[PDB]
Amino acid sequence: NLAPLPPHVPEHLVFDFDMYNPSNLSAGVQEAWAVLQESNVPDLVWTRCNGGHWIATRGQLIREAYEDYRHFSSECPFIPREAGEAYDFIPTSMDPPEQRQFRALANQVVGMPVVDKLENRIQELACSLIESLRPQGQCNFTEDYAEPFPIRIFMLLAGLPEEDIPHLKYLTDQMTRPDGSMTFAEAKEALYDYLIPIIEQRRQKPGTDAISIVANGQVNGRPITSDEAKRMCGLLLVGGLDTVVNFLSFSMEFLAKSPEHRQELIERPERIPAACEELLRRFSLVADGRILTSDYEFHGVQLKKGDQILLPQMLSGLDERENACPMHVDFSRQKVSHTTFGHGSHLCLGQHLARREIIVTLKEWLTRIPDFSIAPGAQIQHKSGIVSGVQALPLVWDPATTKAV
């Protein structure tokens, strides 16, 4: 289902990529996207899928676009347009200078100092979850660890009941990897119906949770409104529920297939941080975009006001001009170049938390379960969207090769 080509698009720039269902999805999600970086593909293409939109394919262009908020606005950051239209999360749907105030607040909640405070709990939950799995010689990593781990940490931070997980997770999944079961706005609404009462409650009787801090915060000398808190909290929710969860699965799928990479980390633990960055490059998973604010000629292509452009954060690090042998995992790369956490003014606030969660998982998993693999005859399915994911991750191991701590 392709849309008719707008008058301003040269037919030689057409490349029909479906960000929701790329063609060689079988090969893996990062591999499916990397088709865009083949020699036959121009740096900047137009796809007729998902209503028609530009896609920058090279790291240089993605970064430039990301820096350029004047021309590339966050007002409508998701494709298809109706999704980008319906989304009003803060600070994501704002451009500087306005963004800055909201950012400053969200930072209060997720930032470095918070992670530092939460460190022991992160370590505590990881150890507990792993130890619980160890003796079984088999899990569903996606349901068994990748979900509970990051989610429970978020739930704790946000001061929300664990019981709400299944419902929230569903709504979140609808936003990034739409199923066809709702509509973006419907999804957004359901999430907001959830949040409203909680916010009201935390305005009246504040706590120490993230929601309380956002609900009662200051923005540009005055108090945040109820609508604004709702909108910030909505973003925090998607970030907490849908990001780290998918990343861990890609990473774990790779480790399960590469004994030598596992060993490397076991013997030379000083490499973990470095390996964390490398995996963030190779298994990058986010793709969003921007909206043209005016007619603008970018790298010789004419962009028209209102055109949307996908600037796949995923792609920068997979770009050969950025990293030699992109698809190869090397923990000793001299320079790991990625924009996994974004670029420009919208740099991920939650990066510190995400990194802490990754490093803890690697260290702790390898400590206890040094030797594992994918279950025989299991076919791993990746899913594409705004955030890409792994459907399920059947792992097996010999309990006798594990180590209790």
Ligand X SMILES: CCCCCC[C@@](O)(Cn1ccnc1)c1ccc(Cl)cc1Cl
Torsion of CA 219, 225, 230, 232, to 10 degrees: -10
- Window contacting ligand HEM (CB under 6 A); options: 25-33, 42-50, 291-299, 343-351: 343-351
Q: How far is the CB of 11 from ligand X (least distance, A)?
A: 29
348 binds ligand X (CB under 6 A): yes
As separate numbers, helices (DSSP H) first and strands (DSSP E) second, the chain gives 16, 14
- Choices 50-58, 129-137, 297-305, 336-344 (CB under 6 A): range interacting with ligand HEM: 336-344
Alpha helices in 258-397 (DSSP H): 259-267, 272-282, 313-316, 351-368
Taking CB under 6 A as the criterion, the residue among 17, 54, 87, 141 binding ligand X is: 87
Q: At its nearest, how many Å lie between ligand HEM and the CB of residue 2?
A: 26
Beta carbons of 322 and 313 less than 8 angstroms apart? no
> Residues 81, 152, 177, 203: which is the catalytic one?
177
Sole binder of ligand HEM in the list 212, 243, 316, 402 (CB under 6 A): 243
Helices 244-257 and 351-368: angle between axes, nearest 10 degrees: 30
Q: Which is nearer to ligand X, 171 or 224 (CB)?
A: 171
- Number of chain positions touching ligand X (CB under 6 A): 17
The binder of ligand HEM chosen from 30, 176, 251, 313 (CB under 6 A): 313
Amino acid of residue 315: L
Which listed residue (243, 339, 340, 361) is catalytic? 243
Which residue in the list 350, 353, 361, 385 is annotated as catalytic?
350
Say if strands 382-383 and 389-390 run parallel, antiparallel, or are unpaired: antiparallel
State in angstroms the smallest separation of the CB of 310 from ligand HEM.
11
Which residues inside 290-329 make contact with ligand X, applying CB under 6 A? 313
| Cα angle: 59, vertex 63, 67; to 5 degrees | 175
Among 279, 354, 360, 380, binds ligand HEM (CB under 6 A): 354
CA distance 391 to 42: 32
In Å, what is the CA distance from 215 to each residue of 118, 231, 233? 21, 10, 9
Active site residue 243: yes
